[PDB]
Copies of this chain bind each other. A is one copy, B any other.
Amino acid sequence: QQAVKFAYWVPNVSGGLVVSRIEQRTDWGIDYNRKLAQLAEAAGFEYALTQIRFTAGYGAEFQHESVAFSHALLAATSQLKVIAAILPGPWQPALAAKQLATIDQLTNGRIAVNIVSGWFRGEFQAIGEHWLEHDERYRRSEEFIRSLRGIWSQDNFTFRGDFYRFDNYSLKPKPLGRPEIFQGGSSRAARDMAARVSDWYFTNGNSVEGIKAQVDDIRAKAAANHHSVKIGVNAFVIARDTEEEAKAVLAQIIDQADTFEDLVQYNDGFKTNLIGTPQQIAERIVALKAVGVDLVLAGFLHFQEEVEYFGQRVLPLVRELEAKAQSART
């Protein structure tokens, strides 16, 4: 029954929304992102989620390294937390645990981690990494996560895994706080891992009924393991003063595609339907809160403008609706 938390996609990779050639006032540079992070902190966003890439993709020509970029965004803010994306394979838990702990010490305990298991083989092939089977990649990520928790929590951590080994490893200093572990993915392997070792699980964008079904499945598995997991939903937010204007922006995205079902195949956040007036979006967010959603991961076309707009128009309405819901229960 706690307040809904909000996070935004850090555009630390170029291209933005690569499937549409619509003009976007978004940049991947540090100066743009420093201002965006400060705007997001002032707007009421709690988390900033970075993206991890090594090779250029179909539309994303430049990518800042996620961990170094997370440290830079943290140094430009005061209370905003930044989720550093980690890709097992090119990343190893020993370095990831120690680097995230140091950054946590330098930023007053405001760093989190998002473990991505990888979807594109070409990124691994370019950097000399082998391409493991789909479920096998999640076995390795689960050992990666358990290593992070053990290294961060024990004086003499020992782990005898199929992918990672530790023998009386002592990390000092440890994180100031307990870095939260975010994780996405929609496959059975992804939600079996989240139901065991993850703090946050990003469920795929869907309708209110579909998201409720995804929430019930993950909580049922988590309860069987006696594990607690909070749930966030990915959403592409188009907030305008009029419903027609917001629906016109969605039309321009499809019209300048490089159908509506094609956007879902690339970005599931459109199915969340956070498109319309600020009052409509706030009502749908609270409706998602009723089915178990604890966090909204927002994507925007013009990040600096729409994040500021979100904090002045949509977020206050969400808080007012939350107080209204809280007052009716008592």
Contacts and interface: CB of A to CB of B under 8 A. Distances in A.
A242 interface: no
A130 B105 CA distance: 30
Interface in A111-162: 121, 125-128, 130-136, 160-162
A76 to B, nearest CB: 10
B128 A94 contact: yes
Contact of A132 (B62, B72, B133): B133
A100 to B, nearest CB: 8
Contacts of A62: 172-173
A328 interface: no
A128 B165 contact: yes
A212 to B, nearest CB: 34
A102 B132 contact: no
A30 B74 CA distance: 15
Contacts of A94: 54, 90, 127-128
A207 interface: no
A61 B166 contact: no
A126 B166 contact: yes
Contacts of A167: 125-126, 128, 162
A101 interface: yes
B102 A65 contact: yes
Nearest to A94: B127
Contacts of A98: 54, 63, 65
Interface in A36-82: 54-57, 61-65, 67-69, 71-72, 75
Contacts of A30: 105-106
Nearest to A137: B133
Contacts of A95: 54, 65, 90-91, 95
A168 interface: yes
Contact of A166 (B72, B92, B101, B128): B128
Identify which of A125, A128, A134, A168 gathers the most chain B CB atoms within 10 Å of its CB: A128
B136 A121 contact: yes
B132 A130 contact: yes
Contact of A69 (B102, B133, B160, B165): B102
Contact of A71 (B71, B101, B130): B71
Identify which of A63, A99, A126, A127 gathers the most chain B CB atoms within 10 Å of its CB: A127
Given A68-B71, A128-B167, 19 more contacts: A54-B94, A54-B95, A54-B169, A54-B171, A55-B169, A62-B172, A62-B173, A64-B102, A65-B95, A68-B102, A72-B75, A90-B94, A92-B127, A121-B133, A127-B165, A127-B166, A133-B134, A160-B160, A162-B165
Interface of A: 30, 54-57, 61-65, 67-69, 71-72, 75, 90-92, 94-95, 98-99, 101-103, 105-106, 121, 125-128, 130-136, 160-173
- Closest 5 A-B residue pairs measured CB to CB? A128-B165, A160-B160, A56-B170, A65-B102, A94-B127
8 contacts: A54-B169, A63-B98, A65-B101, A90-B95, A91-B95, A128-B167, A130-B132, A160-B160
